[PDB]
Design a protein around this ligand. Sequence first.
Ligand SMILES: *[C@@H]1O[C@H](CO)[C@@H](O[C@@H]2O[C@H](CO)[C@@H](O[C@@H]3O[C@H](CO)[C@@H](O)[C@H](O)[C@@H]3O)[C@H](O)[C@H]2NC(C)=O)[C@H](O)[C@H]1NC(C)=O
Ligand SMILES: *[C@@H]1O[C@H](CO)[C@@H](O[C@@H]2O[C@H](CO)[C@@H](O[C@@H]3O[C@H](CO)[C@@H](O)[C@H](O)[C@@H]3O)[C@H](O)[C@H]2NC(C)=O)[C@H](O)[C@H]1NC(C)=O
Ligand SMILES: *[C@@H]1O[C@H](CO)[C@@H](O)[C@H](O)[C@H]1NC(C)=O
Ligand SMILES: *[C@@H]1O[C@H](CO)[C@@H](O)[C@H](O)[C@H]1NC(C)=O
Ligand SMILES: *[C@@H]1O[C@H](CO)[C@@H](O)[C@H](O)[C@H]1NC(C)=O
Ligand SMILES: *[C@@H]1O[C@H](CO)[C@@H](O)[C@H](O)[C@H]1NC(C)=O
Ligand SMILES: *[C@@H]1O[C@H](CO)[C@@H](O)[C@H](O)[C@H]1NC(C)=O
Lengths: 295, 49, 728, 49
Amino acid sequence: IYVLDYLNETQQLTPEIKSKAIGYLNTGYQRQLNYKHYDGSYSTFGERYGRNQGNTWLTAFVLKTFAQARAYIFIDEAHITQALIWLSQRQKDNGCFRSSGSLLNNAIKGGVEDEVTLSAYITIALLEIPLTVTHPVVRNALFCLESAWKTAQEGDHGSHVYTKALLAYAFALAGNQDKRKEVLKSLNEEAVKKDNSVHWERPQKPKAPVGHFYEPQAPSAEVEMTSYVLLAYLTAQPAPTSEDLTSATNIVKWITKQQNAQGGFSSTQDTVVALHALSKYGAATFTRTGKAAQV
Amino acid sequence: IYVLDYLNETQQLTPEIKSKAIGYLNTGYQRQLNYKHYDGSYSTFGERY
Amino acid sequence: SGKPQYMVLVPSLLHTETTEKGCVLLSYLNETVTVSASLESVRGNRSLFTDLEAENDVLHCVAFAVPKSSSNEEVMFLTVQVKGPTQEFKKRTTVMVKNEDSLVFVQTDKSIYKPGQTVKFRVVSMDENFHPLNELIPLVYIQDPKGNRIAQWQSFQLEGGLKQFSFPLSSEPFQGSYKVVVQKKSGGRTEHPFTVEEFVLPKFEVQVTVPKIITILEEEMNVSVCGLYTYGKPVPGHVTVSICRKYSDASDCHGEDSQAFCEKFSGQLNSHGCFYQQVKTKVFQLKRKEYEMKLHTEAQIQEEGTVVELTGRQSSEITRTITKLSFVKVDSHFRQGIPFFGQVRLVDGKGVPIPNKVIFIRGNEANYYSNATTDEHGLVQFSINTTNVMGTSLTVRVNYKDRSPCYGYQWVSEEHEEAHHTAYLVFSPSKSFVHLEPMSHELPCGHTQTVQAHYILNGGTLLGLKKLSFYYLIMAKGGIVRTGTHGLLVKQEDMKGHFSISIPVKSDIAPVARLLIYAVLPTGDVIGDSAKYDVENCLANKVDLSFSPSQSLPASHAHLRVTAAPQSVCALRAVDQSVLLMKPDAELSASSVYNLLPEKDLTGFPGPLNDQDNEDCINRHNVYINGITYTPVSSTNEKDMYSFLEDMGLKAFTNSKIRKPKMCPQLQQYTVRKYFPETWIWDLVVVNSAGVAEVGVTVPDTITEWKAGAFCLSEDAGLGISSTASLR
Amino acid sequence: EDCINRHNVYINGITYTPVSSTNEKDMYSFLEDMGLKAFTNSKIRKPKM
Ligand SMILES: *[C@@H]1O[C@H](CO)[C@@H](O[C@@H]2O[C@H](CO)[C@@H](O[C@@H]3O[C@H](CO)[C@@H](O)[C@H](O)[C@@H]3O)[C@H](O)[C@H]2NC(C)=O)[C@H](O)[C@H]1NC(C)=O
Ligand SMILES: *[C@@H]1O[C@H](CO)[C@@H](O[C@@H]2O[C@H](CO)[C@@H](O[C@@H]3O[C@H](CO)[C@@H](O)[C@H](O)[C@@H]3O)[C@H](O)[C@H]2NC(C)=O)[C@H](O)[C@H]1NC(C)=O
Ligand SMILES: *[C@@H]1O[C@H](CO)[C@@H](O)[C@H](O)[C@H]1NC(C)=O
Ligand SMILES: *[C@@H]1O[C@H](CO)[C@@H](O)[C@H](O)[C@H]1NC(C)=O
Ligand SMILES: *[C@@H]1O[C@H](CO)[C@@H](O)[C@H](O)[C@H]1NC(C)=O
Ligand SMILES: *[C@@H]1O[C@H](CO)[C@@H](O)[C@H](O)[C@H]1NC(C)=O
Ligand SMILES: *[C@@H]1O[C@H](CO)[C@@H](O)[C@H](O)[C@H]1NC(C)=O
């Protein structure tokens, strides 16, 4: 879906590959339907038996993906609605969503599985759908986000990067321009700026005994978080400003330079959100009509 | 499909059942795709061998 | 003193375009409370807000209204917010709203029509409460059978809660079953059939008598035939009764007669009285392979040669299960600290009690093997002191765990029912509880009633206060209806048990009457239980019909009287009961209006909404057992307060421990001029403040029954259904 | 012969739970690994159900 978006936004698209991708989308969509739950949740296997319970993160991923798919191909609103009520059911009055761990591998998930990060990813997936901030779920979620950002800001460490980035994106979608600029400033303070671009890594190297190789329990999630920061900077109510676009250009340069020759990026999460951010950047900057620039 | 056609031609149709049938059509379509042949033909089982 | 307490109760299935009540309970320090419920439609944006001031230990019930929705059936997010000067609480869930359809029905002036006649029918509409509702109906039509619809009326609006229509059928109408169909705005449809054919008016009806239920151990059978006539007088003639057993050894296809053994008895229906006959069921072979009993009686009335047939006792149940005992007051739950007493009835076959007969009550998981005996009423009240494990199984038998005669021969049809029942104990973290001794039964109406309650308080209030309280709700019609409270100066530190409750049964209560009661303890603890009273099918608006009496000879002066509300309307259908003598009407009674209702009783949350899970996972590294060995983990299976309110049909938001502390699963994974007959009166009449009285015209040469059906309606009291005064 | 297995484990408290075999050292095992054997009435072995 995000590949289709990148191609359409860049105008580098043909109807042949479009039809091919359409067929792939329909097939994968139904195959995913083959793993949902009776209530509307999702899991690794699920269907063909009921001796399991769904996962939350996976359901959110399905929700976001189905939303964009709805943007291009036809889909049933009943499924997104069911997933939405399910997530709301798995939410707490004060606390945030619970991580109903039923996954197979953490590589697919580009996060640290922290309840705050999970809740943030959820609410951003919700806000990606056109949903009013006065809505209940997003209200409680915003309370969680505000509290988590407050504790992570006053404290010397709140993971220092991933959280703050996703929080910034969420705040940007809500409308709290002030909170957006504040957390964004906090992020910019801990910059990993290079010769002609800028970016952010994990806490420069993980402190505790870590490593050995293969990204064990830590997929590096650098492309995804950087793209999240990008998408945040690119969001505003009237239209974005200029400064945010400059920083966006920097990180975009880093992103395109980080691409993989085999295709995509290091994983699925990063490729998805990265292409999403690039698509929005194209929708903002690139214009198929504007063709008479004089400098 | 022909049921949808009968309803649309007779005007006795609502968007709810329309969406329901659309989902059924897509599902049955893919399930049928699960039985075609490599050349494009069709059989009872076919695929997976 | 203790923790502050709040509690909001609301049904799960909400109806629109009307009012529905929800209750709230508040108490304990920092009482300047403000509660607010917000029902919001998630997808898109919809919001219905409601507020209410809240004080100490008050159970106030507010009636919020809901208007129509865009879609038909849809879920919604209900969020309750409690704000105290120094406290706050918020809890939400998924409430299912439904654009319910009204309960509409049809009534015809006749059941069977002949060519050239005018079909007259009435359309009635109503809501859950039976207060008449005015409405613009999109469609009502009469249809011929080929789908060649015979008549059609569009967009008419009901005003007095009903509307009457008429359609003159022709001289050469299509014959068969026709049908009246009404279509409501919601897309809903309702069908009321009626037939059109030729027929002669019968001046008599056969009425036979045979056991409604014939069983295995039967050597003979009583049979009788009596024929009612004009004014129910006796009729002389001949009778041919064909008592029969149906579905024999024959194949039953193209050459074999399905008809099994038949016995034909000829009787001479005398001048006075009726005919009797004692038959022997030896020829029927009332055993394993042969089927049911159809009795086709055919009476031939003299001087006309008119034969009429009646199909009786087809379902005489040759039941392999004999001595089928019973139960009556078998409690579904128990407690590990109480003597529960279950009342059990024992009957056999047809339904007659068996007196002075030894029986055995076996209680497994409690080791209660005892003997008892069937008294004059075949009732036995057995009590068991419960201090045992989770589930108790109770059975009762008069024979033993096997069919005494030839059980497994593959060619026998004898059996004996075994009373079986299972009961679960309630959960009680405080070790205190309530249990009602109900009059679980056919509750009357228009009367008071007392239900007794047993409270076993293990220490009762730990610190709390002196006054403790109980709050009860008698809910109905998938909603609520009545509420109330009660409290008591608790004993200092013991488990005091007896206290009764009183409630009126005037009306406004479905056949089902779900009563629940819960007592709150200031320590953040609560207890409670349920009960079932199958209310008698009676209506709110009392109604009755009378008449200036039966008198022969067409003297027009005759009267009909009706008693109902002081300002109402009444649909009167006085029918010359000749066609009605032939074929009956179509389910016109209180029970009909009741079963037409949508979801008579609400039990269990509806389908779409699943639940409201929690997060309190108590899974230890290992179950932590010191002693003989360590133990693994496993889920429990016992009733709970949350389950009480779930089976009740509603939902609630609280803070106290309601649900059982269920643990999260394992994370680890891999002089006369004939008038029109077959009818008499069909009209509407106004009811003044003293009962209406119409003067009907006694008609000539129409000697049959005269069923007078009264269907009244009043905006204040509701509808009314009163009997068939047969001014013969 | 000591079999303390109840019908249901009789696990009072918040919930019930099944039985299982333990895994811990015992005096009987101390004397077993010691090499010798002894006759005594006291509670030496664990009450294995
Ligand atoms: C790819 O996605 C775009 C959505 O961005 C699909 O629509 C094209 O979208 C642009 C806006 O993004 C439309 O532009 C409009 O032009 C009018 C003047 O004609 C202007 O007033 C509007 O403000 C807006 O700029 C454009 O009309 C629209 N359709 C086109 C180009 O045919 C696009 O269809 C997608 N590509 C596909 C389906 O191949
Ligand atoms: C149902 O099937 C029809 C095809 O039969 C789909 O297209 C509809 O076709 C009708 C003609 O059969 C269109 O009516 C047209 O009206 C114009 C004047 O406005 C007239 O000049 C044309 O000759 C023709 O009569 C109609 O516009 C068109 N769309 C409709 C009916 O909405 C229709 O889309 C199908 N509907 C479904 C599948 O929901
Ligand atoms: C809410 O729904 C109504 C329904 O007509 C719509 O008019 C309105 O724009 C929506 N938003 C708000 C904030 O009311
Ligand atoms: C309100 O309730 C709290 C909770 O226990 C209690 O401690 C306090 O005394 C009450 N009054 C206040 C906070 O003014
Ligand atoms: C049947 O009729 C006989 C007399 O004919 C009578 O004594 C008996 O009580 C009746 N009822 C039965 C046998 O159930
Ligand atoms: C059951 O016990 C009672 C004594 O309590 C005894 O009289 C009776 O005979 C016993 N049952 C039978 C079938 O004898
Ligand atoms: C019921 O019998 C049990 C036997 O364990 C006894 O403990 C209990 O006291 C008896 N019931 C009453 C009310 O005493």
